Symmetry: C2
Subunit: 64 residues, 2 copies
Amino acid sequence: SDTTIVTVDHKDFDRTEKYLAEHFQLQNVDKADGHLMINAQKNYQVILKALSELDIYPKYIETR
Amino acid sequence: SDTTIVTVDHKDFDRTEKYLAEHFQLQNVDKADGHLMINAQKNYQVILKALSELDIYPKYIETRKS
């Protein structure tokens, strides 16, 4: 029942928030620290590619 | 967390391996499973941008104790 946390630059948070809300199952957000928690992605390729197309590159990505 | 592991498609392994060795401390490798181990990375942006420019997107990336 694990979860995937994406961490981005503050300047990328709003667009990352918008994209993940529209394209994945967005659960929690912690804007102060730049974290967004979505349903676990076993393979990161699709999310990393889509964010790259927005010129967004995560500071971090991890699965609890 | 001692090390960062980058996992790619077999397709991307050689090019990813060349990139990681040129910019980081490439340590162990597992070509069969697509794993490349480098010194631990606190911030993933530099690696992800560089690989994105090569149209390479990791299957996985993680920082474990090793």
